[PDB]
Amino acid sequence: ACPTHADSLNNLANIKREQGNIEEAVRLYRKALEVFPEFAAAHSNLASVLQQQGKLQEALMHYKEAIRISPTFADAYSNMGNTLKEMQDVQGALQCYTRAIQINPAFADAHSNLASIHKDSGNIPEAIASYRTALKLKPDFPDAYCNLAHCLQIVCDWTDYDERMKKLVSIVADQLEKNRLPSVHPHHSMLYPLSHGFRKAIAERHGNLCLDKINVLHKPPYEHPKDLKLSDGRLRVGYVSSDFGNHPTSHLMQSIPGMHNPDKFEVFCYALSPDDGTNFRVKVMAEANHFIDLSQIPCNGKAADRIHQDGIHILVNMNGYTKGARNELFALRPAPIQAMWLGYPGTSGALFMDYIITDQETSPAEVAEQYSEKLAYMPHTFFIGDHANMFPHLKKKAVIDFIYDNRIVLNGIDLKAFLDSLPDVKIVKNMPVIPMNTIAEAVIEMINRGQIQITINGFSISNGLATTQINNKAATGEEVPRTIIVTTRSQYGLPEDAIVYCNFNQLYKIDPSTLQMWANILKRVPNSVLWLLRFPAVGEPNIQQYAQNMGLPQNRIIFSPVAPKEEHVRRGQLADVCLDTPLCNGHTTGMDVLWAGTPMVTMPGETLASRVAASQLTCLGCLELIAKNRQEYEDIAVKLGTDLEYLKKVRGKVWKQRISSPLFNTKQYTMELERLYLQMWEHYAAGNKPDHMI
């Protein structure tokens, strides 16, 4: 009836949407549609705010109405693509973006949204190409600039790096001042030189999005247990994770549910992911007191009701802002105590989180300001790994004298029996050494010939590069390998007569400053090499180009492919020293390299993510590997690479202390986690709100 009036109502709705008044936007778009039912722009604009409230099906219905009314409405197609992408319909999203760009070639938002599919598929050069098209058409485009910056970080393109970081910080500042959702993702924010205040505000605004989605449910506050009477004096602990399956989180904590004291604790595991069929999933399902698949319960209201009805005292957030998170569940507060643990190396910034489980080394008291949560300290490190259970063949080793601990390495469950079948095995202060006999030449020939395995004295001797051909489950870490495995520097092109510095982290953890520190070390330690991973492969030529410009020849940096889990951990035995990334430390990869007995040099920063390595080394008991500044990092690394007596001493310390220290003791860890859980409970039950447990 009146397009002009509907049109004013649509514009007013748009102004309200900008101001963050989403409920008022919805009210005004709906009145525009009463005044002009066939108003395509109102259907599409309304669908977008419905998408913000998690009403994806109702959004889809309005987008389809917009396109029914206006078949070449580019905005409706690009907006509908966003809703489909969130519904995990990547195919439909692509059709929508491609259709929006068919219609309007100059549509910056649609190029940026298409870039987001390329990014999410792993196609980073194509994501870069599309983001760059978006920024050429719309130079003021925070979402495209911030996502481009993350793409450039993944592939180690440091073109104009310091000016890039300045514009990132500037965009965040402007979005925080104007009360807009920052275009920098909280998880991504750990890679950029943002103030603690900006990192915490980014987190806080993302946490606050969960409310747009739970507010439309009109759920009242839950009533919480105030004692353990209903649960027989047992504390009900709920572990909420997308990562119960073949995921690093499971490779760290798969043992902890099973190891809880069932006299004091009732363990519930809330999976946000379907069953991926792996032993990781099998074990947590079998060893938890209860296992609830919330992938089956997509409504956060019904899912939260289920947690509340189970009687949970401490609900544990293992995702934070990682893939698969359903922080909406935490936003509804189905549990009286809600704690961040292990999955996310930073603050939620979120009203609905009470505690972050951390430690004095990771999160010292003077940086409490960085976190919205109260600090809950584990006694040594909050970090834990399942290495003792997953990889017990790496508990012991033997070498072939071709005396080096890390040129040719044997590992196996039956290693001692195999060695006892040989007549000429020496020991060293202990390390068994096979001399260059018939057996040794056979083992080496297998490696040089690229053979899968041989038999010696009835014992299966397997090529460490061929584990997936031998036992696919042994390759993933789902089972212990049953053969004796040979690992050699020759398998990876590493020099026999020079120091190997390694870093097995995603390349996005490297910045120019870090590669310059590494170059400084290599130039002080002749013939040494840096061993890095194709993580991903497209990052490799960038690193090489930067390293060559710093004076390092291509042959000083050795790249390997990312390996199946068991080979990645096993081959860390071939390194002399791990050089930790100061920007964001190795977390999982720190535990991995230490389990192989490789010393790791670290420079802790201020962020949780920049201090995990120092916390791991403190728990291990190797303070000599923690640097106070860049000069000290370079000095420690150079000393380990030039003084072979000191190297041997530091390597022995790590080799012994990975067993004797608490670092990999999941039984002691679980016992200390239980102490902390009952201190949180006792504090809540006496009627206190959260406080630091330090």
């Binding site: 514009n11 949407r17 977008s48 907006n79 969130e86």
Partner: peptide
């Protein structure tokens, strides 16, 4: 997954 950008349509002329 990567965040996307919704386009607010204002109708024109």
């Amino acid at each position: 997954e990567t965040g996307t950008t919704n386009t607010a349509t204002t109708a024109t002329s």
